[PDB]
Amino acid sequence: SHTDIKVPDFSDYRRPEVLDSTKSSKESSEARKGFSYLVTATTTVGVAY
Amino acid sequence: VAPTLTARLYSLLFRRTSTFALTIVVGALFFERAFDQGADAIYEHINEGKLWKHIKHKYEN
Amino acid sequence: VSASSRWLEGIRKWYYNAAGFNKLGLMRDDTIHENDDVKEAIRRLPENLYNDRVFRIKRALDLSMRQQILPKEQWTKYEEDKSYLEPYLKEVIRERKEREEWAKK
Amino acid sequence: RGVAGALRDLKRSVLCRESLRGQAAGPLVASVSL
Amino acid sequence: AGVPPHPQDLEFTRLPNGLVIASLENYAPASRIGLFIKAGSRYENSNNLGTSHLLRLASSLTTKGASSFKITRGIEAVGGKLSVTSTRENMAYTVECLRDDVDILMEFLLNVTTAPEFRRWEVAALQPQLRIDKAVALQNPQAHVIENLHAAAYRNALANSLYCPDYRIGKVTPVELHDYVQNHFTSARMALIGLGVSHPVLKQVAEQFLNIRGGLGLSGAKAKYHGGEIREQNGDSLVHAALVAESAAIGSAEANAFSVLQHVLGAGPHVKRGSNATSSLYQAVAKGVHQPFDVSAFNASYSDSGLFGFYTISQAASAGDVIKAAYNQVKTIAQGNLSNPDVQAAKNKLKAGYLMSVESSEGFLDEVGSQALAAGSYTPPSTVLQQIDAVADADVINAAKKFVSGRKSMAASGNLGHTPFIDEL
Amino acid sequence: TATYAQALQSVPETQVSQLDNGLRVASEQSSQPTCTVGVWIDAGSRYESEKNNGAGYFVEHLAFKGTKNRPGNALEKEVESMGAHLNAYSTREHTAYYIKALSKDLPKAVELLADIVQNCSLEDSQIEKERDVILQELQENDTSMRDVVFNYLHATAFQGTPLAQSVEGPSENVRKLSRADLTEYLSRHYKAPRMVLAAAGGLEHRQLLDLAQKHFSGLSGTYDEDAVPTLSPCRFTGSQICHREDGLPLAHVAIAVEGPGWAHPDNVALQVANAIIGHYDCTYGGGAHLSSPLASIAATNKLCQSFQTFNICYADTGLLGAHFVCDHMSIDDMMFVLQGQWMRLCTSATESEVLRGKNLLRNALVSHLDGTTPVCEDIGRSLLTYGRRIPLAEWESRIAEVDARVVREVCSKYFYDQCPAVAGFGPIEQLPDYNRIRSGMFWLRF
Amino acid sequence: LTRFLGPRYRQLARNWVPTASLWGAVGAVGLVWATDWRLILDWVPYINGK
């Protein structure tokens, strides 16, 4: 009965590089992490200034 | 399939916290010069010839 | 064995009586500072030594509160001071040193 | 891992007749390890 | 060509002090060693029940040549293993590692078995493990049935549980462990078995470190069969039940007849999800029972006794019907209704099963180790199959006759509202 | 006497042949009177669509229930009467049917495997029987918290892909899977080039190849009319699934990152790392003195009933991580120590503990290939995954390369600053939030 | 006291050495930047000014 479970679709929230369920996510893992950590870096720059 | 700029920034700078922090402190140093340089340039271009920095040349002697 | 190592004991008996924990009916091992090694050694004591150690310490804290001592008849004689804890304590340390030698392999 | 054999956390339930074959004992053994 | 080399032969030796050594050089990448001792739970008495269980949990405790810390770290550094398996008759200290590290694990194995210290505090910290270890085992309803089955069958010795009785947890003393190893870990009671080791090494080890005298000679504390029944009312969904009678001691020819009779009736499934078409007991029960169940012949053979019968699992309401159907099917065999093709098929399963059980090193070492203790010899498989072939159909029938007419022992657990007593069969 | 290095040369190399139709026949000879032979197939749930998921598992129930030449229970009778044993299994990528039997019974055993694969009865009345059986097996699986939480891990980690599917399929598919669905699955996937006839025991490779050319010649040729199953890559998704159920006595957690795949040399170094963390449950003897810090701490402070690391491989992907079982107030502490060891191996692995992990893997590899059945399994599986048998002499070489620098580089590649997949089941109120879990995958000090 | 000198502890030292020397670059650069230390900041090209 727990095999009836299916995870719902998240395409409404996924980023562009991920919606292809037949394409590896590691191809975009560094660009996606880098974008979010670039936000943080420039934030601490302004707080530093 | 060359990784974009954001991916090459992560691999080289951000993955390690130390290098992530080093470029924050260096980013602060170079951001400070260009921000106060550019910002002051706007404040006075608005107020051109209105304050002492501009009329300093009249009363030199 | 000789007369020179016998006055060595005489000055250790002297220091013993001067240290004065025998005046509270206590033994040397009752006064060891409890660290992790000592707390383990005490944990390993059989019931009789543990209970004896508890009462001697309790009797001494009672005396210390009143700033009193026991009669000289009841002082711990240097000759009869059983180092009951050092066998257990020496094995605790021996085990710890073994771990420490493995930790740097 | 500890073992108990004899055939020659809520564990799991048995209901059908196919998953029940192999359960009836056939001499006990107790084993222990590191 | 891609062929294996000349397979070496097992070497075997009996020292005058009673110790037995058996070695085999299969040139394998790993080595396995075992010290098998006649020290199972039958050798406990009613003043020290559970001692052999706690002893079975204390292999990593401190010895004279190795701290508890060194045993655990020494073996793990090499990636080796140390295990302790117990029968009602034997304890088996097994050690496994790569053949370059046999020196290390042999030293640990000897310290465990020859030089345990059983320090008061280490023993004290270990007693809660009895409760955990027993609790895990009794998650199987089979475990408590078999334990109760032996307690109902025998007056002493084999009545003893592999697992410590609840009232003894915390009360097994370091003195009892000391006395137990002194009385039972003797040269006359031991066998040193090795795979991937040369015989001169094992013999050297045995002569130097395993010459222990005294204790107890191979006591004639004979197990006295009695019969009886134990009934555990609980809230399991199914009823487990076992019904047996005294059978034959291992090694004797009558025991081979019982082994063959087991595979005539049905020992276990050979095909996944099968109906067990060639299982006599299963088809007998399945005719008058169309609900889930299981049934299997049960065969247990010991140095001086044995139990044979069957084991049933069924819905609580179908308990008696499954029992009685199983019992009547055995009665049929005792009445001489047994074809010869059915015996040749059972001898096929038993012969095939035996060889399969000795494919691996662990199963091979266990058989050699238990052969050495029970028989004092090694019997190669070609001779085992010869002894199986020597079983006649009348021997199988007489074995079934001994069951029908013998005083019975029964153990059952579950909702026993429809589970018959012995006298109701 | 012989050394460990010398003993690894003394293993016979697996002889390999290929039939004219595509089937591959591989054997490792020994001096055993017994043996095991079986057919390994590139089939499983990953090849199935949502509409016919669970089909190959339906087939497993029917494979032994009848055939054209031996209808009904006639197949059970023949193997039981010669004392043989017959078994099968299905993973998400592989399907196997094998027999254990005497060496003299090899020719009959090969015949039966051929008759099972090719000529299957699949009577419509047996199907309706096996339908109610599978549904009961599903109710049984629901009570194995371990099997649930790993189906949950696959479901979230590979969401949107074939690998997310369970092997057994959903209850709805079981109730509507028709005989036409099953024969379509077989005709497509059970083709000679995607199968291996593996055997292990006392048997000459000549004999096995002769029987293959005899009983497996009728298989479909190399061409299949242009309809080949081509496994697409499967997206891994950093995600979390929590099934809260406080009525259960103990919580199950499984957490993993994406692994490389079958034929990637990184798996060796990853397995060494997993061996350092190791495994544990409450019945082990070592407890406080175990080498693994996770194990030692968990026994001392009683943080779990059991834990185990794992490296599940699939084609070009996998699940690398750990799973554990603990009281409801110990989940946070277990995850803290677990992640702390991943981080510690990424950044500061030492040479001594890597030698231990290497030796643990060496021991685990030799002792697993002990007996005719696990060798025959390694033969069959290794040809579907590597396309060849890797001798033990090679595995030892790929291990000795590993040193502390290798595990730090390999572990950081897969563990450090990566999005994990998480699956929880039971009283998991204290299961840390995913952002907290995600922040445990890096150290600010590094 | 000397528990921490052996094969494994010199390996840990050499593992964390590249990191600590970077946190010294964070602190040192952070000290220059915060206090406006002019003795260092003259040779770096762009910030020269004001």
Ligand SMILES: CCCCCCCCCCCCCC(=O)OC[C@H](COP(=O)(O)OCC[N+](C)(C)C)OC(=O)CCCCCCCCCCCCC
């Ligand atoms: C004597 C002179 C010495 C001068 C020294 C100068 C040093 C300057 C700071 C450099 C330290 C950087 C440390 C660092 O970024 O980690 C702290 C967190 C981590 O961010 P997060 O993106 O979570 O993880 C990054 C993981 N990584 C490294 C593998 C990519 O980063 C963040 O999450 C921080 C972002 C929020 C900052 C705001 C906090 C201030 C309080 C509120 C301000 C407004 C109202 C008061």
Ligand SMILES: CCCCCC(=O)OC[C@H](COP(=O)([O-])OCCN)OC(=O)CCCCC
């Ligand atoms: C001078 C530098 C001080 C650094 C403080 C710090 O990093 O705190 C932890 C978090 C981010 O780390 P994490 O929560 O991912 O945990 C990482 C686990 N490895 O950052 C914040 O959100 C805290 C906000 C502080 C405001 C006063």
Ligand SMILES: CCCCCC(=O)OC[C@H](COP(=O)([O-])OCCN)OC(=O)CCCCC
């Ligand atoms: C610990 C608190 C430090 C306070 C220093 C201060 O107030 O600033 C003065 C100088 C200015 O740099 P300089 O090139 O004019 O040089 C002027 C020389 N007198 O900055 C420094 O030199 C920074 C030195 C920091 C050392 C700990």
